UniProtKB/Swiss-Prot annotation, chains A, B:
Gene: HRAS
Lineage: Eukaryota, Metazoa, Chordata, Craniata, Vertebrata
Membrane topology term: Lipid-anchor
Record protein name field: GTPase HRas
Keyword list, A-Z: Acetylation, Cell membrane, Cytoplasm, Disease variant, Glycoprotein, Golgi apparatus, GTP-binding, Hydrolase, Isopeptide bond, Lipoprotein, Membrane, Methylation, Nucleotide-binding, Nucleus, Palmitate, Prenylation, Proto-oncogene, S-nitrosylation, Ubl conjugation
EC number, UniProt record: 3.6.5.2
Subcellular location: Cell membrane; Golgi apparatus; Golgi apparatus membrane
Organism: Homo sapiens
Length: 171, 171
């Protein structure tokens, strides 16, 4: 069926692995080797289209750029994630977004901005600032929580839909 | 009288020198040595307070950081400017804003975002994206044109007022 190659990107400790794993196997995982980078797949039905999700769970020292090259130029969409209680991870969103536009020759590649850990009752980054950023970038912003699972399907599926619109726009 | 040390910052070719000079001597200047970095002063009355504006017109290769050190930690406010028809200068706004927060130990230093050259009927950066960015940063955005002079006083004076509020907030 159709196959979407997605890449999950963002600073270390934001919850990239917990989100990915929550999506694939429905269980929250804590303590998962910060170093391990691997792909994950799942057959899903989104909006009636059945498809294959090919997700790259990025890890490793790569100064805010292209963690896993031959997925990065080939990724069809990216999940830019930050933790809602870590302003740095948030401030670093710009750099990830610039390497992505950099290897892909465009400021028009499907992405979604993800504010993770919204279960934490605390916060150093607030909803309106994130969403203004997204609004300036032109992409959606969605808050999730790998822990309670809130928003994880909405985040990945919202990313699929963007890719879809983007493929239909060339006709 | 009161004295405000302001720094004009941004990529080369955006109009930092034309704006500064337009403010100080009311005349548009084209072709002004991209390399020359110097300060400029003017006595003005803003909101009934008479004051001395001490402006640093930043120039020189300094990778998006602290052009003129002993003005940068001492600047009381910064004018972050980009050209409305130069998306790169615009995308680089983040880096300037991070060195400023970097030498000043805070994500709370008076700044104003300036979209210059609004006389050009063209544009690669649009009003709503700039303002969403500003809104996410928490600072004002003002469009100016060193050429026709539109907005140049509003930009500097709006920067003075921010500094004022910021000084009054400690009481
Ligand atoms: N409270 C809470 N902790 C989370 C959430 N997402 C991830 N974590 C924890 O944050 C840390 C980093 O998660 P991980 O997926 O390994 O981060 P990564 O470096 O982006 O892969 C671990 O302690 C996770 O269990 C979340 O939504 N809520
Ligand atoms: N049309 C137009 N050109 C401008 C404007 N501001 C500056 N320029 C021109 O842009 C170039 C760069 O100006 P300058 O102040 O030297 O740029 P800087 O490197 O930021 O100091 C010169 O050609 C200026 O005359 C503006 O508002 N409108
Ligand atoms: Mg991980
Ligand atoms: Mg100059």
């Amino acid at each position: 069926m159709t196959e979407y190659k997605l890449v999950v990107v963002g600073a270390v400790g934001v919850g990239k692995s917990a989100l990915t794993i929550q999506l694939i196997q429905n269980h929250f995982v804590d303590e998962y080797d910060p170093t391990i980078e691997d792909s994950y797949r799942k057959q899903v039905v989104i909006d009636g289209e059945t498809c294959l999700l090919d997700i790259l769970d990025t890890a490793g020292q790569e100064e805010y750029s292209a963690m896993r090259d031959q997925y990065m130029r080939t990724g069809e969409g990216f999940l830019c994630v930050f933790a809602i209680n870590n302003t740095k991870s948030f401030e670093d969103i710009h750099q990830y977004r610039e390497q992505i536009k950099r290897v892909k020759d465009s400021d028009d590649v499907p992405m979604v901005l993800v504010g993770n850990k919204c279960d934490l009752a605390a916060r150093t980054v607030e909803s309106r600032q994130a969403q203004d950023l997204a609004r300036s970038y032109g992409i959606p912003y969605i808050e999730t929580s790998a822990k309670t699972r809130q928003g994880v399907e909405d985040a990945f599926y919202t990313l699929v839909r963007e890719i879809r619109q983007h493929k239909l726009r060339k006709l």
